[PDB]
Design a protein around this motif. Structure first.
Motif, short mmCIF file in Angstrom:
data_model
loop_
_atom_site.label_atom_id
_atom_site.label_comp_id
_atom_site.label_asym_id
_atom_site.label_seq_id
_atom_site.Cartn_x
_atom_site.Cartn_y
_atom_site.Cartn_z
N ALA A 154 -23.65 -33.33 -29.30
CA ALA A 154 -23.37 -32.04 -29.91
C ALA A 154 -21.94 -31.65 -29.62
O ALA A 154 -21.36 -32.10 -28.63
CB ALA A 154 -24.34 -30.97 -29.38
N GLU A 155 -21.36 -30.81 -30.48
CA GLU A 155 -19.96 -30.43 -30.34
C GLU A 155 -19.83 -29.27 -29.34
O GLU A 155 -19.49 -28.16 -29.71
CB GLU A 155 -19.36 -30.09 -31.72
CG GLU A 155 -17.83 -30.01 -31.73
CD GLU A 155 -17.23 -29.75 -33.12
OE1 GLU A 155 -17.64 -30.36 -34.15
OE2 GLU A 155 -16.32 -28.89 -33.19
N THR A 156 -20.10 -29.57 -28.08
CA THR A 156 -20.15 -28.57 -27.03
C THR A 156 -19.08 -28.81 -26.00
O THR A 156 -18.54 -29.91 -25.92
CB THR A 156 -21.48 -28.65 -26.28
OG1 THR A 156 -21.62 -29.95 -25.68
CG2 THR A 156 -22.63 -28.41 -27.25
N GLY A 157 -18.79 -27.79 -25.20
CA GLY A 157 -17.78 -27.93 -24.15
C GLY A 157 -18.13 -29.08 -23.21
O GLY A 157 -17.25 -29.88 -22.85
N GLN A 158 -19.40 -29.18 -22.84
CA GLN A 158 -19.78 -30.23 -21.87
C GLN A 158 -19.52 -31.63 -22.43
O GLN A 158 -18.98 -32.48 -21.73
CB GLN A 158 -21.23 -30.08 -21.38
CG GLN A 158 -21.56 -30.78 -20.05
CD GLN A 158 -22.96 -30.41 -19.54
OE1 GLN A 158 -23.22 -29.24 -19.19
NE2 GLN A 158 -23.87 -31.39 -19.51
N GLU A 159 -19.87 -31.87 -23.69
CA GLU A 159 -19.67 -33.20 -24.27
C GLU A 159 -18.20 -33.47 -24.55
O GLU A 159 -17.75 -34.61 -24.48
CB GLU A 159 -20.47 -33.35 -25.57
CG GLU A 159 -21.95 -33.27 -25.32
CD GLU A 159 -22.47 -34.47 -24.57
OE1 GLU A 159 -21.94 -35.59 -24.82
OE2 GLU A 159 -23.41 -34.29 -23.75
N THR A 160 -17.48 -32.41 -24.87
CA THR A 160 -16.05 -32.53 -25.14
C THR A 160 -15.30 -32.87 -23.85
O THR A 160 -14.43 -33.73 -23.83
CB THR A 160 -15.48 -31.22 -25.79
OG1 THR A 160 -16.20 -30.97 -27.02
CG2 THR A 160 -14.00 -31.35 -26.09
N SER B 130 -14.23 -23.69 -30.69
CA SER B 130 -15.18 -23.09 -29.73
C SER B 130 -15.44 -23.98 -28.52
O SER B 130 -15.61 -23.46 -27.39
CB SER B 130 -16.51 -22.75 -30.41
OG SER B 130 -17.09 -23.89 -31.01
N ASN B 131 -15.48 -25.28 -28.75
CA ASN B 131 -15.78 -26.23 -27.68
C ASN B 131 -14.62 -26.41 -26.69
O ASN B 131 -14.76 -27.11 -25.68
CB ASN B 131 -16.23 -27.58 -28.26
CG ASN B 131 -15.28 -28.15 -29.28
OD1 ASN B 131 -14.81 -27.46 -30.19
ND2 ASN B 131 -15.04 -29.46 -29.18
N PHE B 132 -13.49 -25.76 -26.97
CA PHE B 132 -12.35 -25.84 -26.05
C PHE B 132 -12.11 -24.56 -25.26
O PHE B 132 -11.19 -24.50 -24.43
CB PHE B 132 -11.08 -26.25 -26.79
CG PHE B 132 -11.18 -27.58 -27.45
CD1 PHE B 132 -11.02 -28.77 -26.71
CD2 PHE B 132 -11.41 -27.68 -28.80
CE1 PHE B 132 -11.11 -30.02 -27.31
CE2 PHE B 132 -11.51 -28.95 -29.43
CZ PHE B 132 -11.37 -30.12 -28.67
N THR B 133 -12.94 -23.56 -25.48
CA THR B 133 -12.71 -22.25 -24.83
C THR B 133 -13.34 -22.10 -23.45
O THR B 133 -13.01 -21.15 -22.72
CB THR B 133 -13.21 -21.08 -25.72
OG1 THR B 133 -14.61 -21.23 -25.95
CG2 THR B 133 -12.49 -21.08 -27.05
N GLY B 134 -14.25 -22.99 -23.09
CA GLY B 134 -15.12 -22.73 -21.96
C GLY B 134 -14.61 -23.28 -20.65
O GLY B 134 -13.63 -24.02 -20.63
N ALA B 135 -15.31 -22.97 -19.57
CA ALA B 135 -14.84 -23.36 -18.25
C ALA B 135 -14.87 -24.88 -18.03
O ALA B 135 -14.00 -25.41 -17.34
CB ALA B 135 -15.63 -22.65 -17.17
N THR B 136 -15.83 -25.57 -18.64
CA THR B 136 -16.03 -26.99 -18.38
C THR B 136 -14.89 -27.88 -18.91
O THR B 136 -14.37 -28.73 -18.18
CB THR B 136 -17.41 -27.49 -18.85
OG1 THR B 136 -18.44 -26.85 -18.09
CG2 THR B 136 -17.53 -28.98 -18.63
N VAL B 137 -14.48 -27.66 -20.17
CA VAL B 137 -13.34 -28.37 -20.72
C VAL B 137 -12.03 -28.05 -19.99
O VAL B 137 -11.22 -28.93 -19.75
CB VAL B 137 -13.15 -28.12 -22.24
CG1 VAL B 137 -11.89 -28.80 -22.76
CG2 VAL B 137 -14.33 -28.67 -23.00
N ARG B 138 -11.84 -26.77 -19.67
CA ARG B 138 -10.69 -26.30 -18.93
C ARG B 138 -10.63 -27.02 -17.57
O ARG B 138 -9.59 -27.53 -17.18
CB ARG B 138 -10.76 -24.77 -18.78
CG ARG B 138 -9.76 -24.14 -17.83
CD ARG B 138 -10.21 -22.71 -17.44
NE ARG B 138 -9.13 -22.01 -16.73
CZ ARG B 138 -9.01 -21.95 -15.40
NH1 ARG B 138 -9.93 -22.51 -14.62
NH2 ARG B 138 -7.99 -21.30 -14.86
N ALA B 139 -11.76 -27.10 -16.90
CA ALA B 139 -11.81 -27.71 -15.58
C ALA B 139 -11.54 -29.21 -15.67
O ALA B 139 -10.85 -29.75 -14.80
CB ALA B 139 -13.14 -27.46 -14.94
#
Ligand SMILES: Cn1nc(-c2cc(Br)c3c(c2)OCO3)cc1N
Ligand SMILES: Cn1nc(-c2cc(Br)c3c(c2)OCO3)cc1N
Ligand SMILES: [Cl-]
Ligand SMILES: [Cl-]
Ligand SMILES: [Mg+2]
Lengths: 134, 138
Positions: free
Chosen positions: B35-41, B63-72
């Motif tokens: 899925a096109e989610t922060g975690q998978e991205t 949207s998938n680049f806004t979250g804490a997981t991709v940032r981290a």
């Protein structure tokens, strides 16, 4: 020899990890896979061969290499079947608590291994392959 | 520049494909993701950064680049976030689709073909990325 890789399996947390090492550089590609089957092994080999020039892979010659699907994938990709791994487990050890999932820990370990530095394994593999092209 | 990659999403058969292109060489890494989610991205970016020297990734900033997981993941890996490719990749996928039961297999055959294709004594994208990165090291 620049096109030569070694593929081994290792097991952690009831899961299976395939580790491919580029013999001349020590550079690694590794993935957690759902089962040590011909289908998953063929897929892994296909992925690896699309990313680096893979000529020969030395494997353990076990059950997952005997079937039609791995044979077909190596044939298609033009691959022949003819120290880093305890280190990998050690690095996964050091990063495990930072990841919810083993797969994430494995990829952090691949990153660390390949970047660790006179040259890193990443630098070595590109130097080796570039030199060959010339 | 040698450390610059572009990351885009492509959709086929109800599935999501992430395609990373090394801008200077045209070399690609691509995978079908759940899925096109922060975690998978974030996972995809971590994988990519462990395999090639990724300094900057140009993304669609969605949207998938806004979250804490991709940032981290980008922070950890030392990455900064600062049409024809996915079309041609789609074309090769079409070409090989019947040879694989699963879309993921067809995608990886397409990556193989794209990266190895010698367009003439020209070079492949695979040869080009290694030449570029080796030159930068030397
Ligand atoms: C320490 N260091 N490591 C690199 C480097 C890291 C990775 Br992974 C590579 C690579 C070069 O080429 C293919 O994959 C560049 C520098 N300076
Ligand atoms: C056409 N051709 N392509 C290569 C080649 C293919 C891939 Br994929 C690579 C690479 C070189 O370095 C990093 O990934 C070697 C030859 N002869
Ligand atoms: Cl194995
Ligand atoms: Cl995306
Ligand atoms: Mg996009």
């Amino acid at each position: 020899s620049p096109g030569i890789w070694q593929l081994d399996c290792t097991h952690l947390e009831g899961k299976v990890i395939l580790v491919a090492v580029h013999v001349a550089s020590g550079y690694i590609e590794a993935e957690v896979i759902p089962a040590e089957t011909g289908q998953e092994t063929a897929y892994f080999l296909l992925k690896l061969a699309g990313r680096w020039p893979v000529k020969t892979v030395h494997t353990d010659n076990g059950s997952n290499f005997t079937g039609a699907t791995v044979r077909a994938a190596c044939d298609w990709a033009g691959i022949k079947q003819e120290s880093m791994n305890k280190e990998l487990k050690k690095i996964i050890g050091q990063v495990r608590d930072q990841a919810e999932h083993l797969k994430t820990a494995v990829q952090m370990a691949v990153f660390i291994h390949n970047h660790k530095r006179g040259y890193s394994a990443g630098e070595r593999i590109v130097d080796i392959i570039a030199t060959d092209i010339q």
